[PDB]
Amino acid sequence: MNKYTIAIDLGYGQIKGINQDNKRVIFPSIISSGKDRSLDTFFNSIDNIVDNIHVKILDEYFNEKEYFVGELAKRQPSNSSFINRDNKINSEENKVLLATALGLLIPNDLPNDTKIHIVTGLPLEHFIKQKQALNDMLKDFEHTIKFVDHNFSRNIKFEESNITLFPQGAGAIFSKINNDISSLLIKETFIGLIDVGFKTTDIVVFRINKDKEPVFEQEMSATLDGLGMINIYNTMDKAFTDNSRDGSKLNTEQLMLLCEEGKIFFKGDYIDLKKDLIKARKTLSTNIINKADGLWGSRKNSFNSIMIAGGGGKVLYNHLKLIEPNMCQLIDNPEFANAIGYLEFGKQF
Amino acid sequence: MNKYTIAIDLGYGQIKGINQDNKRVIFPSIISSGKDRSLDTFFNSIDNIVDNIHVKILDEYFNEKEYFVGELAKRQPSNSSFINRDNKINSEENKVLLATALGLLIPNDLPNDTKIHIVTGLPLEHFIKQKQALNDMLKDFEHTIKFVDHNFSRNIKFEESNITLFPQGAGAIFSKINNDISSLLIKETFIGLIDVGFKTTDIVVFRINKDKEPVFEQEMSATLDGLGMINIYNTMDKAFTDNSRDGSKLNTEQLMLLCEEGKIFFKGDYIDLKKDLIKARKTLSTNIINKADGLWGSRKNSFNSIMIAGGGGKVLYNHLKLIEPNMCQLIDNPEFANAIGYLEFGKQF
Amino acid sequence: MNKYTIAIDLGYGQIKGINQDNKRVIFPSIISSGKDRSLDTFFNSIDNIVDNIHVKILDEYFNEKEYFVGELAKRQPSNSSFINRDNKINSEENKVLLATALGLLIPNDLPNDTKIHIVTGLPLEHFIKQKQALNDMLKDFEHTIKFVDHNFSRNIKFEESNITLFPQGAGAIFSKINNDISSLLIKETFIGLIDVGFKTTDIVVFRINKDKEPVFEQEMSATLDGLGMINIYNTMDKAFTDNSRDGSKLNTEQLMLLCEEGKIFFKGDYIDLKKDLIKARKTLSTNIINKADGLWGSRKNSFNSIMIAGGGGKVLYNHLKLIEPNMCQLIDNPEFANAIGYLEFGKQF
Amino acid sequence: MNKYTIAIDLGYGQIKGINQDNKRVIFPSIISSGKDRSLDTFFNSIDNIVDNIHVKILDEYFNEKEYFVGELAKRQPSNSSFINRDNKINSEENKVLLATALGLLIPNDLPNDTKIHIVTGLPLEHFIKQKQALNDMLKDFEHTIKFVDHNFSRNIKFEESNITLFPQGAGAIFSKINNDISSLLIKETFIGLIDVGFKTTDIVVFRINKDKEPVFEQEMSATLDGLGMINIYNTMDKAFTDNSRDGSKLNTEQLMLLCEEGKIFFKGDYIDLKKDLIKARKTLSTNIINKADGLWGSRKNSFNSIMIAGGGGKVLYNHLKLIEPNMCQLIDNPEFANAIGYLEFGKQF
Ligand SMILES: Nc1ncnc2c1ncn2[C@@H]1O[C@H](COP(=O)(O)OP(=O)(O)O)[C@@H](O)[C@H]1O
Ligand SMILES: Nc1ncnc2c1ncn2[C@@H]1O[C@H](COP(=O)(O)OP(=O)(O)O)[C@@H](O)[C@H]1O
Ligand SMILES: Nc1ncnc2c1ncn2[C@@H]1O[C@H](COP(=O)(O)OP(=O)(O)O)[C@@H](O)[C@H]1O
Ligand SMILES: Nc1ncnc2c1ncn2[C@@H]1O[C@H](COP(=O)(O)OP(=O)(O)O)[C@@H](O)[C@H]1O
Ligand SMILES: [Mg+2]
Ligand SMILES: [Mg+2]
Ligand SMILES: [Mg+2]
Numbered sequence A, B, C, D: 001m002n003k004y005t006i007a008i009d010l011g012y013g014q015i016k017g018i019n020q021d022n023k024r025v026i027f028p029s030i031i032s033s034g035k036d037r038s039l040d041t042f043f044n045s046i047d048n049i050v051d052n053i054h055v056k057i058l059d060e061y062f063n064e065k066e067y068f069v070g071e072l073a074k075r076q077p078s079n080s081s082f083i084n085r086d087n088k089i090n091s092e093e094n095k096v097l098l099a100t101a102l103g104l105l106i107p108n109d110l111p112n113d114t115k116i117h118i119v120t121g122l123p124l125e126h127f128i129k130q131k132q133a134l135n136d137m138l139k140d141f142e143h144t145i146k147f148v149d150h151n152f153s154r155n156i157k158f159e160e161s162n163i164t165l166f167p168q169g170a171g172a173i174f175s176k177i178n179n180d181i182s183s184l185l186i187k188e189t190f191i192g193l194i195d196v197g198f199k200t201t202d203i204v205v206f207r208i209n210k211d212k213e214p215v216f217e218q219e220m221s222a223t224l225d226g227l228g229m230i231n232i233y234n235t236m237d238k239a240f241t242d243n244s245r246d247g248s249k250l251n252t253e254q255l256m257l258l259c260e261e262g263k264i265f266f267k268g269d270y271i272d273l274k275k276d277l278i279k280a281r282k283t284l285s286t287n288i289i290n291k292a293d294g295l296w297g298s299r300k301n302s303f304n305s306i307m308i309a310g311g312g313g314k315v316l317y318n319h320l321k322l323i324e325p326n327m328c329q330l331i332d333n334p335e336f337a338n339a340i341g342y343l344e345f346g347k348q349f
């Protein structure tokens, strides 16, 4: 019958997802072992299901494992250490996280003849290179989910022609602004889109033609592998150990707490690292502009709009504005820029 | 219906209880039979009713059984065994001990329809295991008490909506410090509560969130069964047979008498075990901190205040200081820490 | 700095309010759907922002809607019907009217030390009766405004210890005139306050003691539900169908245009009901006197000051003068006496 | 929207600023620590905000420092240096002075997308040498300032293409007299402008052409570093200590009062130093005669008008008349000479 549409993302930083109903979810890309949560059930009332995703996922052979995942995994000390998430696209780390949002974004009691289009993405250099790696993994995806503490299952199995493949940052401007920026696009310019990811920051440019339609440039656009917010967590982790002078290491949760604040609490004291947070944010923003103008000669003057996105783009927008003032603006949903771009351009099918 | 409130404990070493009117009692959990106290009545003034609990207990079948209980039963040689006491919460021991502090704290001049909200406790790990059995027992409760040598009686029966079930150490720092630690809790810290009881040792933490609300962590919190003051009494008892050099052994009253002082008067002279009293209390304090850090990795750095509870921590506070100095501290009522925590957090109804 | 204060009124005739800084807004309680405005921007300049509030309301769930509200909704023939708008205080329609006046009373660029202490109200009998639903909704409230044609947003979200309720016109004479009427209040004299609104009408009196301090009379003050200005609009509608005799009915605008004028411009002609206008005005105010003396037996003889308020009280001054001439008077702002009464007696906080 | 005009001066003696609407401020260039002003409110009225500048300053990373600046800081004994204040134009001291300058000139009720164009001042040699140091720091500026005891904050931010830079002595004769002295200037003369600043004195001349337009001479004009009012405070410093015959040093406050009165009240006595104070101004009056003719050969006879400026020259006008008696003349506002020129000639945009 008619098939539903759910747009997800495989971001190493945090998983970003939305359905056809615009009901959207967001949670960090961290998994852990699952343990029986009934003692904490009586003390604090579990209201936020996204905060408390204890979950068990069957295979087709009745094998399933307990999992804490996300914020609940970030409270665990032995979770996925988040600096070492598996770069294999077919990892079980990928498997649980992929079924996680699909459990959360399928509403209750849809008809079984109504399937769901899933819309995903890859980093831009890694899209065609790893397309069939994901394509077989999407067809291999055949599970059944069970939520602990909320107790509603989903049957999850899809073949080819139920899936959708467009890169990270591609449909973010190829949809959702492409039918809206027509007042600004005139002829033979370039719109600028930079998705500031956690591991990898993506640089993507669209040339507009004579016919007021976007066309893609691949020599002026690239994936910055190893450039992203992961540099800041790695930098400030040295900054805490250099300021503590003891070898005291923050955990995984204090790491992500640090580069949102710059003021970690530590043993009756706030170890002040706000100055080093200023040091990282100006350094990374300078590094993005330099790699941008590596791809950009005098065609930077051929720009008319520069949009940025990502959670890093939410927190670097002032320093990343300095490519071009009055042209470096921010997109509406910096996290969900891929998500609705996957959604509306997934509505073509 | 202005329903009354009484908060009690089921502590193995002693029973700690308090009413709505903040009238509080404390007495050891030792029972014996009741025998006719008219001879000693003319000798010594039976004045302290808490010291002299000769009590008459009916049942639903009107089977009166007098009992010496508490301090007077401790004076009896044929008392409860009490060092290998059965841990059944539905025991006749616990039927007497729970009904003991009721009539000792049920006040005078109650209305005809007005009931009493009773608040009890469980061990934290066994709160899942033993929730039914106390709920079996409190529903079962239908008796009538009577006080020998003080000439008054109480009716005692309860139903549901009068029962209240929170674990040991749950409301002690949830409430009772609730508006006081609110100025201390700031952002993403844990607070430390350790109950050093007689038989059991509890560890319980609370993550406070961004929103200044405590949330519970079941995996940094456990009941250390087999660790407590019961080890020290059992250690020094064999040490008493050592330093006496004759194989002579104490009784049950001298057992509790010893490790409150350490210098037992035996055969016309003191017997000195003060060195081994310092040894065993430091030995248990070593075992607490290590098993505390069994649940506490570098999250010990995420503490801001540690409190200790139970009767043992009051006399361990110098040796239990070594957890985190000037962050660990002593609660003001080490016995009644659970009781007032049962009181106000039991006053939700 | 310190936390900010806003007093607004949820009155169903016209939404009223005045902030901490004595900026005040007022607009009728009419909402409509919003549609984009660029054409009428070019013809006629939007000089008053309150005149032409096209508004978008954000949420985290991405369920934004455009709205015409107040005067801009009054010109709409597709607006709310307003003759049967439901009194659900937790309704989404009440979210539109309440979030409207928030950013209007918040000046541009307030710091984060400022947090808005809202002071709203209920009807008198509906104060205790309908406390918790609005207590739930103001606890629930989390949005962000967007002004079309003026383009500035306000993140609006309220914690507890930021909300405050009072009954309708409670501090209107407990404060705001209480320093002035100390010349007039002497000893055990009832001062009188009447608020004549659209749906409901409240009459509240305060007994003063021997110590010249006011005290509340719950048996000499009540809510006149079903007696208000809406009955004049319901009468003048039926008088117009008695005068037009076609079956034609005025819209939501021409009905509200009538009871201020009495001479509707219909079919290019002044269909007149000036006699039926005054008769319906002596109908309502006489129906107040019976409800006034329904709460006032012989105790009317002890009065010293009758005050009236409400927008209906502005247009029924001589109609309601016959309660007690040479004593009854008019407050300075008949409409804003609720909001300033919420303001000044809200300045306890 | 429209971009407003605010003209300030970075004078090391006193910061001299004005908005587009001619509301102008003046305060000495001294900062100090900001501490809790509560008690001084009740005794004496905090009316003049120029008199009582208690300032909180947020950063964009929000380090929240607090300062007394200017007149209140002059009364503070622990104030800034001001006799050897650092010449770093990018200092935090210069920022706090500039933030205080912007705060009293940015008006309330300014529309939403309006901004401000700002004009600064530079020494005539240092306008090219020290150009980009200031021109980057003004681009760097994004701070939120809080004025205590007046309850209004200012989030102030500036970017490129809104700041504007003209050196000292430029606009006072290029504008502000261009409508007036154009009747006076005829053919091939030089106009004169001598800004007697605190630290540096400014010599600037304009050649008029045949076509009655000003044009600039770089070798008939220079910046007199080490020549100005600051030599008089240095001279009167040792003039007191030699006349005290004790080494008793005046404070920073009495230093400023000394060259305004010459009769300082000291140890219950007026110490009169009128002898050296007449000599010290004539010492300064001598050192500007010589530097005038150092730039002016027989071209001194090619003059039609000499103006003087600077706050020191107001009490030096008759005493610096010795160069050209009645060929020299006086500007209207010797303090505000640079700022009104920066106001008027800064209205290019
Ligand atoms: N409020 C915030 N403060 C600090 N950092 C943030 C915030 N929100 C998001 N981030 C950063 O942005 C990253 C999220 O990037 P995201 O858009 O999910 O890219 P990806 O698709 O690579 O995961 C996080 O790792 C986090 O460090
Ligand atoms: N003054 C004291 N001296 C020595 N030991 C004490 C003293 N007060 C209490 N204790 C010890 O503390 C124990 C009481 O612990 P308690 O807080 O009642 O825990 P529980 O709830 O497990 O019974 C007793 O068994 C006793 O050994
Ligand atoms: N100038 C006026 N002419 C006629 N009626 C008016 C006028 N001003 C106000 N009103 C009437 O008063 C009502 C406003 O009452 P209001 O004080 O806002 O009470 P509420 O708090 O119940 O909304 C309107 O519905 C309107 O009919
Ligand atoms: N009434 C006065 N009496 C004495 N000196 C004054 C008076 N007014 C201003 N001054 C002197 O003039 C100086 C102000 O110079 P100003 O025009 O602000 O130049 P700058 O731009 O270098 O700060 C002060 O340091 C002060 O010594
Ligand atoms: Mg991404
Ligand atoms: Mg205990
Ligand atoms: Mg009203």
Ligand SMILES: [Mg+2]
Pocket (backbone or CB within 6 Å): D009, D011, D168, D195, D196, D197, D198, D310, D338
């Ligand atoms: Mg100057």
